[PDB]
Nucleic acid binder design. Structure first.
Ligand SMILES: [Mg+2]
Ligand SMILES: [Mg+2]
Ligand SMILES: [Mg+2]
Ligand SMILES: [Mg+2]
Ligand SMILES: [Mg+2]
Ligand SMILES: [Mg+2]
Ligand SMILES: [Mg+2]
Ligand SMILES: [Mg+2]
Ligand SMILES: [Mg+2]
Ligand SMILES: [Mg+2]
Ligand SMILES: [Mg+2]
Ligand SMILES: [Mg+2]
Ligand SMILES: [Mg+2]
Ligand SMILES: [Mg+2]
Lengths: 159, 213, 75, 168, 175
RNA sequence: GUCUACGGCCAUACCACCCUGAACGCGCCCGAUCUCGUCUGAUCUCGGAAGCUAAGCAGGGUCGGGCCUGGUUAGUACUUGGAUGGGAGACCGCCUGGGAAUACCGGGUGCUGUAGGCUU
RNA sequence: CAAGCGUUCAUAGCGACGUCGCUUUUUGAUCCUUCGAUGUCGGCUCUUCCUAUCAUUGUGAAGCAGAAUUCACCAAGCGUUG
RNA sequence: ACAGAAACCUCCCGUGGAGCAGAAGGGCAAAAGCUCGCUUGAUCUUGAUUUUCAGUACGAAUACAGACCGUGAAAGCGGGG
RNA sequence: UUUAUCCGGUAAAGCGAAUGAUUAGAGGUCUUGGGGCCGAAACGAUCUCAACCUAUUCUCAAACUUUAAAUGGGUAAGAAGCCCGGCUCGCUGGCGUGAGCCGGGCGUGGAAUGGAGUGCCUAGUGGGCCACUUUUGGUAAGCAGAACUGGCGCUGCGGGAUGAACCGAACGCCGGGUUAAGGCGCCCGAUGCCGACGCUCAUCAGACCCCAGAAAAGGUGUUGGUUGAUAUAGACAGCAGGACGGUGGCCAUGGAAGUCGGAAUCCGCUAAGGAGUGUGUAACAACUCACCUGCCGAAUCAACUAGCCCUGAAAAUGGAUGGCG
């Protein structure tokens, strides 16, 4: 049997990456979070107060609370089946803004724009994304060379 | 003494190197990984003969022992006591284990069977991959056949199979042998006893000023 | 009388037979867990919305008649 | 030189039955609707579609159908999903009764939207009930292994039409 | 890979254009296979061994058969080889005397199977090349190789041994 | 072109040495009356403005070490799936896809934010 | 495989350092079978079978002159006691 | 100077190769290390959450809020280590 | 599954990057030593070995890591969403923040599939076993213990002779057709192909995933290659002549004039003779072999490598590619 300890096996997880042991860069606690914002937890060794727990390391969740230097945040945690939407309290040093959201809200700001315009025209524009289509028959042109002849090369034991 | 090499032939368990975590290891049997005239120069021994493994297996410390000696003996011979250099390129590094021989007296009354099955260190063993070198010899280009036969006898002290191969390098370096003389004059390479130092167009200019001076 | 000591063998089957359910989320989730000084204030904000409903109602008809004028000026 | 268009339509047959089949495999194959062994559906080729055939390749045998292959399937073995029923497509007032909101009105208009993949392939090829084809008269080559090593599985560009003759 | 009667499906193909290099080179290989679908696939097996190219980052431009220019004239084919025996991998030269390059390596695939138990997935054809009268080393081919060629057909066994399965006359084998 | 004050990202900014710095500043620097601190006005605190770029700092320089990026190593090592493939076995080949790391070669060497100067 | 022993000579006979196997007449490991019980040591008697041959038939080897003796082959026919 | 591989003093180099009560593992440099001065946040009080988990306790922990304070020019930090 | 986007420390790699091991030389009185040898002694000379370190080099790590995959884990892909207008606050603040409210203004936001949501009672079970891959003890096990999926238990059918678990495939009762895995001399349905192309002869032949049998090592048995040789200036093989002189050469004498052994060690006659391959002889001789000739007329020789068959290969009621063959 193994030990239930809160920081078991994190020997390699919470470890500051490389050539970064030291002062936390001050930007990381001067960006703002407000309820609704989506956040990806990523623990960190230097700050021990308010750490998450290793099963949330790498997970995302939205924000529901904001205290003086921590953020209440709801993530999903799968347990033997049933997924429990549970809310944890994590100090800011272990948190980033997830740009996972931000591809859309840029497809949105552009979709809303491309619909307000081209509405004075009435021309229906492709608003939906659409997966990578078949590559659309074209030409190839060799100019004045035949292709280069390739031959499988004779084996020889290198060692 | 020791179980036949059968039982410790395959690489089953993760490497068990001698460290603070296993101790009391009996010192490896093979000790001297190179003999002959290890005081040679690169400029006087152009024949990189190899003995390359063909199977992913283990080699006992005591095997590398006999394989070296029996090659020292078909060498200094036809070659002479000065005319070669022999390298063993597998240091027995991984520690092999033995459950304690299930020792019993008379018929028996008890042994506990398997409780604490974990056993003691018994010896050491080399890990070998396909296409990895075991032994390498270097002599004069004159003496090719006697490298082939001296390595051919050492095959018979080894389990599995291994091909004998003559390298395109110069002696023990990494440099293709058709190119050595060219990279020696104009000093892309500088003699360093056995090996040789590859000097690039990188460093301070005064480091050059020594050469071509 | 030794026995097996553990396994997660066909467990994936079992808890996926009723198809692991991401927790059904409604709008308007509970405020339980938010810091008291927020609520202890936002309840006073909510409790006195009505004091100031006259401003809200007349100012609603102002924009409702200014945008009934904006949609009629378009007409 | 010429590089013709990447085929947009591929007709997929399942070629191994249902037991001893992986979890992720079994999910795909019920998204392509190849539920029972040995039936077939027209899948529209696409970066997401192609990357779903890679993952069930040891089970299926897909390829690029030609026109006569489209006709044969649609006429002889073409049943339409109406009120969640496998109802035989005997008259085309059954096709218009389901697809009339898309300009599809007849047995022949179905085949446009199935050949020239078209704006309505989603509704056309989902009112088509999965084609239930007989065993391949003459036998397969090797149900286990891939076409390229003399087998039967996976993609066979345009060679699938020989497999649709002997299986209609 | 499997067999049949092999054919000479030649293929060309480039590594589809990135923004940096807009006109990549073209490569023709003489792939050698029983139909299209595998002749396309043997290509990517050989180009991945030579160029840093894959089926994803590339495209086949031309696949088409090249069919023998002199099919009514017997020729001597030497064909360089490389296969995988049970121990290592070895290079070869072998000679076959049939009248179509395709059939000449259909024979070779039959021999590595017959004389070395090497299946088709182990073999690689370096380059087939038709040869003149001389330059032929194998005396198995070098013996026909003349003008007044002459055999009898000595011990001519009868097939049709189950047309009449019961007969009175014992057969004959001399003709 | 550049500095000073407060900075962001934290070596393309470091380190080693070499050369050059107009004017503003930064500094070295000159004192211990008061404030303050020491075994010591050495540091810290304070009052200064006689000197000098000697150094920090700035700016460059080095077939410089380091870092930052590309190439190669290499479609190599490894690997998702697949077979009534090979092999006594170790292991190995192929099909369907993904795809590294050194040594070895190149290129680069701090970008900027706000507020104030100086070159009027 | 072969460093050596064998006056000389690797291999008549041997054979170190190593390495590959067979065998179930040793002991172990294991706990699959039997706890509504398969009688759990030897000896006596009796049969049959194996050959990893001690003798005898036929042979090849010897550092086999004879005698004696080791080494090996076809061989389990018949012996192997008080 | 006595003074030696070791006492004490001084300069130079010193990314941590020391130290952080203990096992290891993480974390740490005008710090979390060492030296001083001031102290009792190791105090009083509701809840919320994390950790083992049945998602029960106990233990331990994390964010808050309400009091009384300690400290510091102060921002802050502190309800044991 | 795509498209974005974070998370990761395993395989691999590296150790001229840290930590830990570790070989070799070159370089260093680094330091220093402990022995020496030449020195009274001397960083004097020459060594030596120790330890360090300056460029190097051999090999490693589960409880090491600069790097760093594959598979994989999160979210996100809109109406509970955007965009305006306005009220409320005991929180927050130079103003604003922020949250909460009211009021209006605007629709398919990647592919493919399918009707979804939710509450009550509740039986049986809580000995498990096997296989691919991964993997821990163990030498190994039809052994003990995990992962991942799949099965068997709970389940028959075709196939594997037989058989839980392998291969195909999952069973309402039937007629026709067609297949899968397998097969098709006879048992026994199907080759009673004028089937292709080869390989091998076994006095122990060989004959199909699980699976039920063999290894290193050999074998001019035969068949392919690979490489290197030799040759019409006439080889190879065969049959004929010489195989000597300077020379009891030198060491070794116990005998080695060529020959138990070794340092060696080259010329003359040259055509060619090694200061010798061996036979042996106390030593020679005598013989022979390299080397070179005489005769013959064109292909020959050597080392490797792999396919098949042989050797290696020994067990007990008679005997099992299922049998016949
Ligand atoms: Mg199955
Ligand atoms: Mg299978
Ligand atoms: Mg002063
Ligand atoms: Mg200065
Ligand atoms: Mg200066
Ligand atoms: Mg540099
Ligand atoms: Mg002797
Ligand atoms: Mg058990
Ligand atoms: Mg009884
Ligand atoms: Mg016998
Ligand atoms: Mg408080
Ligand atoms: Mg403390
Ligand atoms: Mg780990
Ligand atoms: Mg029970």
């Amino acid at each position: 049997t193994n030990t239930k300890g809160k920081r078991r096996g994190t020997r390699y997880m919470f470890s500051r990456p490389f050539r970064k042991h030291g002062v936390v860069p001050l930007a990381t606690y001067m960006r703002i979070y407000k309820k609704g914002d989506i956040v990806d937890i990523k623990g960190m060794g230097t700050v021990q107060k308010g750490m998450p727990h290793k099963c949330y390391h790498g997970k995302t969740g939205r924000v529901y609370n904001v205290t003086q230097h921590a953020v209440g945040i709801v993530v999903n945690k799968q347990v033997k089946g049933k997924i429990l939407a549970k809310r944890i309290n994590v100090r800011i040093e272990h948190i980033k803004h997830s740009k996972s959201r931000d591809s859309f809200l840029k497809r949105v700001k552009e979709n809303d724009q491309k619909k307000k315009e081209a509405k004075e025209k009435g021309t229906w524009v492709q608003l939906k994304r659409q997966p990578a289509p078949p590559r659309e028959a074209h030409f190839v042109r060799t100019n004045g060379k035949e292709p280069e002849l390739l031959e499988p090369i004779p084996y020889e034991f290198m060692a | 003494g020791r179980r036949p090499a059968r039982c410790y032939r395959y690489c089953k368990n993760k490497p068990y190197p001698k460290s603070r975590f296993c101790r009391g290891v009996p010192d490896a049997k093979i000790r001297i990984f190179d003999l002959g005239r290890k005081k040679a120069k690169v400029d006087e021994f152009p024949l990189g003969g190899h003995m390359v493994s063909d199977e992913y297996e283990q080699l006992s410390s005591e095997a590398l022992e006999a394989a070296r000696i029996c090659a020292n003996k078909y060498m200094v011979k036809s070659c002479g006591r000065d005319g070669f250099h022999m390298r063993v390129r597998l240091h027995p590094f991984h520690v092999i284990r033995i459950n304690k021989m299930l020792s019993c007296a008379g018929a028996d009354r008890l042994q506990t069977g398997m409780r604490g099955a974990f056993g003691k260190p018994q010896g050491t063993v080399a890990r070998v991959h396909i296409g990895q070198v075991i032994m390498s010899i270097r002599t004069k280009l004159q003496n090719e056949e006697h490298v082939i036969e001296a390595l051919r006898r050492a095959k018979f002290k080894f389990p599995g199979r291994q091909k004998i191969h003559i390298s395109k390098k110069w002696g023990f370096t990494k440099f293709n042998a058709d190119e050595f003389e060219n990279m020696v004059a104009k000093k892309c390479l500088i003699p360093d006893g056995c090996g040789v130092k590859y000097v690039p167009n990188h460093g301070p200019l005064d480091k050059w000023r020594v050469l071509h001076s | 009388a030794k026995s097996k000591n553990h396994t997660t063998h066909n467990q994936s089957r079992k808890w996926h037979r009723n198809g692991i359910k991401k927790p059904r989320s409604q709008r308007y989730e509970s405020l339980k867990g938010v810091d008291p000084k927020f609520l202890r204030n936002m309840r006073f904000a909510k409790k006195h919305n009505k004091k100031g409903l006259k401003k809200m109602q007349a100012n609603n008809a102002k924009a409702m008649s200014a945008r009934a004028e904006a949609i009629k000026a378009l007409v | 030189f010429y590089v013709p268009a990447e085929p947009k339509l591929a007709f997929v047959i399942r070629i191994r039955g249902i037991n001893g089949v992986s979890p992720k495999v079994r999910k795909v194959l019920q998204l392509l609707r190849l539920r029972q062994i040995f039936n077939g559906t027209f899948v529209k080729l696409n970066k997401a579609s192609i990357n779903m055939l890679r993952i069930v390749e040891p089970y299926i045998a897909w390829g690029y159908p030609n026109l006569k292959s489209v006709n044969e399937l649609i006429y002889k073995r073409g049943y339409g999903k109406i009120n969640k029923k496998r109802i035989a497509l005997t008259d085309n007032a059954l096709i218009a009764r389901s697809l009339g909101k898309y300009g599809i009105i007849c047995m022949e208009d179905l085949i446009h939207e199935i050949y020239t993949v078209g704006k309505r392939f989603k509704e056309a090829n989902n009112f088509l009930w999965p084609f239930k084809l007989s065993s391949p008269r003459g036998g397969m080559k090797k149900k286990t292994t891939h076409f390229v090593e003399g087998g039967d599985a996976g993609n066979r560009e345009d060679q699938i039409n020989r497999l649709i003759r002997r299986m209609n | 890979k499997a067999s049949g009667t092999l054919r000479e499906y030649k293929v060309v193909g480039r590594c589809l254009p990135t923004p940096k290099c807009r006109t990549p080179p073209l490569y023709r290989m003489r792939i050698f296979a029983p139909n299209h679908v595998v002749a396309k696939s043997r290509f990517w097996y050989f180009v991945s061994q030579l160029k840093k190219m894959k089926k994803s980052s590339g495209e086949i431009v031309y696949c088409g058969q090249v069919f023998e220019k002199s099919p009514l004239r017997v020729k001597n084919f030497g064909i360089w080889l490389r296969y995988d025996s049970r121990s290592g991998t070895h290079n070869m030269y072998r000679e076959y005397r049939d009248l179509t390059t395709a059939g000449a390596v259909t024979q070779c695939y039959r021999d590595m199977g017959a004389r070395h138990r090497a299946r088709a997935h182990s073999i690689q054809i370096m380059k087939v090349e038709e040869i003149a009268a001389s330059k032929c080393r194998r005396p198995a081919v070098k013996q026909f190789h003349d003008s007044k060629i002459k055999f009898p057909l000595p011990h001519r066994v009868l097939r049709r041994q189950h047309k009449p399965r019961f007969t009175t006359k014992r057969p004959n084998t001399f003709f």
